[PDB]
Design a protein around this ligand. Structure first.
Ligand SMILES: CCCCCCCCCCCCCCCC(=O)O
Ligand SMILES: CCCCCCCCCCCCCCCC(=O)O
Lengths: 267, 283, 68, 57, 129, 283, 68, 267, 136
């Protein structure tokens, strides 16, 4: 009647608004909308910190490039927001905290471009390491790359430097870096940015853990995996490129156990 | 109000159609699986379904015990050089594989564990000497309690540690333990660490294992043969079986596709080949 | 304090003046104080897979166009 | 659950009805993705251990 | 299936030894007597050797007894076939054959009828070069 | 409303007769058996019958367990050359004869099977060494599951396969299994095959056994002695007994008259002589 | 949830102030959830052999001529 | 409201479903839906054969190619279904019979391709022969080519082989092979597959004859004529090609006078 | 006598011509290319069970004196509602002379026997492409 469509959308969190014309509706993980911590479920006694619009708004990460030889890309939450304005500040100063997020990945092309990108939100995205000598051997620094995130590879490469090991992840793409076929990845809340149809993928993720609140500094609750399901091709050129961008927004952001600044060693 | 053993909906009769209602065509990019039935695409008959998902409920799927470990203890001669063997084993589901993977279909779970204890025993030295029926004490040593150092130290007195006294040749031992997690559910995958390495701290002082936490530390099981030194040595193995009854699960994950390698998610070289050979144009 | 439950009869004995027909029930008695000791009732419930199948914000009408 | 004749399921097959048609300046070859799932009236019985998982020694 | 992957195509002269092996690692209702079939492009496909999965029920074709023997590794999982004193009459393409439910090779004893998973095929020539 | 244990109808008094009602004469070609009683042909008295067919009801006729197989396992020395023996046996009623024939009075049947497990054990080597009471695990491996290759491989962990842990010297093992047929009843005779040989296919590719189908594939039973290698070998046999309780049957068939020869209906030479010698004019 | 059934008394004890006469019944209690676990009730029913004996389309009057 | 459109359609007959996104609605010949033979209109006495889903489902013929030099294509019903599974079998074994059909021709191109195809259903499509010596001289074999159908020509060619004449049709395109201008062809129920707009044409044809039922073996009730109204061109190439495919489905299929197999000489 | 359940599909299903019973068991000793057929002994009703009990099955007797025909109505019988008729036969038709055929005083009399069969309540599902089995 009025022309309302599921492709055309606009979402607003704070002083930031996202708008699109080629959407494929919107996904709410496990059918649960993000929420504040209920009294019946609460645990820390102190009165909590609810930053609101201060932290809860859209945040754009550093844009990456999609080409024919890219194997995939990954990010963790909250990790990927550790240095984003207030939220991050609020993260570094409080022992505990919880939050939901509305992840919006952007990537438009042309009606002459093709390819499909799988955007998967994996709660507890514990990735696999690079050593065949020692397990669960990836260091904190390499585990949490922050906003830049990381990538997947098509070939496993075991680190043989036993003197000063690399201590990083070596996430094989087809095993979705966890030892499980990417094919089943669809079990996780997800969407597919298939160039023909859509230019974006929007997923709403509630706070998911084994407990009401946790130390966001020590633990990542959600992972963001983006892998090309179909390859990127354009016309007849040999090396096409199309940028991909992720804007993330916390939702129902709350924190407790306020104390002094945490200064982690990131390198 | 739909129970596990209730009949699934009947498939109803449907004839021919030709209109503007589109069941066959959708879009998976949205992330939604088209919920079609046969009548949407083909002409079907009225069929009173009788089958039920009784056998695939979480309860039913885990309604079985699984060997989690195999412990080894003995009772040698008094004249021996090496000390009598007592076994210590940290309580985990991750030494074996079968059970682990089932558990791993999910991210989180709540359950009360039922443990059974099948005990085997055998002679080892080719002699003709004799042994008198053995009794085995399986003490549960929770994190913090003193873990035995000798088969005959003060720990085996068990004033507050739960302990089982199993006589050989009788019904295998079985106990129950409630949901004992420090969290609100047992976590099968942890995307984090225990410590936070800080800038003004030594890297050594700030390191921890990836995916390792207390969420999973339940202490150890200690066992010995209560019998005093016997002239001819006797070997024995306690096989533990865990059944997670009264179970609840959260967040489905894809099942392990490559053989496990350690308690983590790591995999080794040359194991990364799960699928065989099959040509695209053949049945 | 007995717990008498029903049995979904599968194979039927040529009986209906004892077995077969007339609702066959079973008894259960909890002997321990702790719930952890109890046996599995197995009388569980089903749900709608939607939270996994249709985790979409907007209602999916299977007969209509997915994208509109 | 086994590969068996008596309990054979049938054959699934995809064919070109027309053909794929694109204009100029358009990638002549493309791919397709396929998904499979059960319908609201799918059920399984007789619990057994899988063979897609194993522990060597 | 099971895995059936075979090799061993060495064109030896008349009177030499040759070894054939077929993988059977995965454990379905595992290859009972197993099976070895040769297709002579002059004739057709025919059954030859076979030892029961667990038991010692090894059937031998009239033409190959004594010279050709069947044995396997009840662990390393692969099926060996010792073919010695090779005639020129045995020049054919060999194939391994999974006969599932052991009774498939107990009832009929020999394979052929109860055989669902087919092998790849190895060319063996036994000539006078 | 006539139960199995109810009295059969009384025979009533009947005197002399001479008329046009013909009980004695009929015609069997029609396929009907004349339903006569004594009073139809002879003069009888009033008799209150008391006997009942209580003991011949399908239930009652099969209300017994029967040895279906005899399995063999052992526990030899560690120094041995030949590997420790573990038994594998496909679940069928057709290895033995007695039970089979009873089942064969009918074409189809529905029943829940109760299995019992009597276990025997003995020394084999003329020595004076000793063995410690054994425990036997009988795992049920359904079609599709991994069947053990070693007495000590990963299969015996049993995460979803039903397994029995029997301690020697105690009450024989007994379990129950429901009607597990893929059909609506278990078929005792199948007039067909599994595959259809097609014209444009190789005869080899299209062959199957006559009367063989999945209707009867229930997997195997695997058993071992849980005990670790013992210096002096011990042999053991598990005798399985099957009782089909809660039974229902369809279509009566004549009973096997010639000794069986394989799981089919086939018979061999020189066995085809069931009846002895008897002259026509002698009692 | 007990199942009390009757016993068709065969031999009688010189008793009828306990055994013998006054209807002797037995009790049965189902301990398991699955019908497959239950014992055989043995309280079965009989039928008319006709479907085997007189599988004829037309009614057979034993006193009349089979063929008419 | 729900996005329902006349371009997007799906029709289902039996275990076969057709789906499209570029339709131009749907035509029901003369406004009459196919139906079973009414008692008031019946004539053969025997109880009829109604195969249902067995015969009444979509059947795809052999695909032909559209190029610049194609003059047109034709098929007859039931003829074009004579060897299609059950229907054909049911046709060959019964003396009489009746049926309706839903004809669906397929032919998509690109938004860069052009051309218009006239799909005409002509009841009693009695085509013209090739001889100027003898009239109504086309033999049964040449008249009924079956599933492969036939074609139209732009130039009349009279057969001058008086020794062993060709005895076929020589249907001139502009005279719609019948001696009548193609221009009026629109009098027949029809649609136009104009590449710009549509990729398909769907027509529902009821059973049409001078009688309730007839021998389908001896007589064709409906003809299917497809002629390019506008020429096929693409970009600037010289010899473009686009396939055309026809799937046909009987409707309300019934037959009487069951007897022995008919084995006609088709060659 | 070497292999059981060894009769091939072709020999098992002779179709309309059907097959016959024999009075003497003959074991095939051609181990090179076995016959793979049935050898149904008459008195054992080809199944290893005395023909005498055959009457347990629905039946009739064409006793020349009385009758010229036998009519039996058979419902669909299997372990399941429907089955692949191509792979499996549900009913068998056995005709054996209980009494011998004699006429007057001649040595070789002959009388024809004919069977007409009619399906009833015929239904089929899972329509697909033509099955072309190898019958020979
Ligand atoms: C003497 C009896 C022992 C009683 C104490 C049992 C200790 C509780 C351990 C339960 C947790 C086992 C780990 C598996 C849970 C998981 O899968 O995460
Ligand atoms: C550990 C206990 C074993 C449980 C599984 C039992 C497998 C079911 C097999 C039942 C069928 C036996 C075959 C006889 C039936 C018949 O007469 O046709």
């Amino acid at each position: 009647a009025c022309g309302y469509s599921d492709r055309v959308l606009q979402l607003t969190l704070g002083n930031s608004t996202i708008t699109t014309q080629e959407a494929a509706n919107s996904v709410v993980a496990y059918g649960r909308w993000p929420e504040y911590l209920r009294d019946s479920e609460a645990n820390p006694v102190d009165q909590p910190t609810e930053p609101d619009v201060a932290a809860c708004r859209f945040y754009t990460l550093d844009t990456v490039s999609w080409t024919k030889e890219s194997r995939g890309w990954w990010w963790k939450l909250p990790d990927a927001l550790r240095d984003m304005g207030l939220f991050g500040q609020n993260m570094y100063y409080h022992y505990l905290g919880r939050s939901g997020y509305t992840v919006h990945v952007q990537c438009n092309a042309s009606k002459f471009h093709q390819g499909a990108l799988g955007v998967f939100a994996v709660p507890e995205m514990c990735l696999a390491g690079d050593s065949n000598t020692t397990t669960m051997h990836t260091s904190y620094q390499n585990a949490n790359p922050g906003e830049k995130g990381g990538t997947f590879t098509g070939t496993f490469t075991p680190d043989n430097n036993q003197t000063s090991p690399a201590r990083r992840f070596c996430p094989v793409d087809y095993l979705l870096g966890n030892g499980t076929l990417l094919g089943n990845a669809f079990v996780f809340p997800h969407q597919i940015i298939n160039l023909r149809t859509n230019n974006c993928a929007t997923l709403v993720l509630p706070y998911v853990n084994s407990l009401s609140i946790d130390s966001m500094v020590k633990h990542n609750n959600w992972g963001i995996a983006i892998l090309p399901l179909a390859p990127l091709n354009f016309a007849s050129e040999s090396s096409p490129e199309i940028p991909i961008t992720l804007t993330i927004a916390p939702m129902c952001c709350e924190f407790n156990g306020l104390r002094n600044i945490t200064l982690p060693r990131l390198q | 109000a739909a129970t596990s053993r209730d009949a699934l909906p009947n498939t109803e009769a449907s004839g021919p159609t030709h209109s503007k209602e589109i069941p066959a065509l959708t879009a998976v990019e949205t992330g939604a699986t088209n919920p079609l039935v046969p009548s949407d695409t083909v002409q079907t008959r009225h069929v009173v379904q009788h089958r039920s998902r009784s056998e695939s409920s979480i309860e039913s799927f885990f309604a079985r015990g699984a060997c989690v470990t195999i412990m080894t203890v003995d009772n040698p001669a008094s004249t021996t050089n090496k000390d009598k063997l007592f076994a210590v084993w940290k309580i985990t589901y991750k030494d074996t594989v079968q059970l682990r993977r089932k558990l791993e279909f999910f991210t989180y779970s709540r359950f009360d564990m039922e443990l059974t204890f099948v005990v085997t025993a055998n002679f080892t030295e080719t002699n003709n000497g004799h042994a008198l029926n053995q009794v085995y004490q399986i003490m549960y040593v929770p994190p913090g309690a003193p873990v035995p150092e000798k088969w005959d130290d003060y720990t085996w007195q068990t004033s507050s540690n739960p302990s089982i006294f199993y006589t050989y040749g009788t019904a295998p031992a079985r106990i129950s333990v409630p949901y004992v997690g420090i969290s609100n559910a047992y976590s099968h995958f942890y995307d984090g660490f225990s410590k936070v390495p800080l800038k003004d701290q030594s890297a050594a002082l700030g390191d921890s294992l990836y995916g390792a936490a207390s969420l999973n530390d339940f202490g150890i099981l200690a066992v010995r043969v209560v019998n005093d030194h016997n002239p001819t040595k006797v070997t024995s193995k306690i096989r533990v079986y865990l059944k997670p009854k009264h179970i609840r699960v959260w967040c489905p994950r894809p099942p392990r596709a490559v053989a496990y390698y350690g308690p983590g998610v790591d995999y080794k070289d040359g194991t990364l080949t799960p699928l065989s050979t099959k040509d695209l144009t053949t049945y | 304090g007995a717990q008498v439950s029903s049995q979904k009869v599968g194979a039927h004995e040529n009986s209906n003046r004892a077995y077969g027909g007339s609702t066959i029930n079973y008894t259960t008695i909890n002997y321990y104080r702790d719930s952890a000791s109890n046996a599995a009732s197995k009388q569980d419930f089903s749900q709608d897979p939607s939270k996994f199948t249709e985790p979409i914000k907007d209602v999916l009408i299977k007969t209509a166009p997915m994208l509109n | 659950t086994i590969d068996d004749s008596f309990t054979e399921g049938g054959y699934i097959s995809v064919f070109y009805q027309t053909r794929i048609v694109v204009p100029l300046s358009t990638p002549r070859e493309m791919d397709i993705l396929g998904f499979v799932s059960a319908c609201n009236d799918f059920s399984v019985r007789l619990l057994r251990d899988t063979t897609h998982i194993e522990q060597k020694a | 299936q099971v895995q059936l992957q075979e090799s061993g195509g060495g064109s030896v002269q008349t009177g030499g030894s040759l070894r054939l092996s077929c993988a059977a690692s995965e454990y379905t209702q595992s290859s009972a007597c197993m099976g070895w079939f040769r297709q002579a492009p002059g004739k057709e496909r025919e059954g030859v050797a076979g030892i029961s999965r667990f038991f010692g029920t090894a059937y031998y074709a009239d033409s190959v007894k004594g010279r050709f023997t069947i044995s396997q590794d009840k662990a390393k999982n692969t099926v060996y076939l010792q073919m010695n004193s090779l005639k020129p009459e045995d020049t054919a393409i060999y194939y391994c054959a999974a006969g599932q439910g052991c009774l498939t090779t107990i009832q009929a004893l020999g394979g052929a009828y109860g055989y669902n998973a087919w092998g790849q095929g190895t060319q063996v020539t036994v000539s006078s070069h």
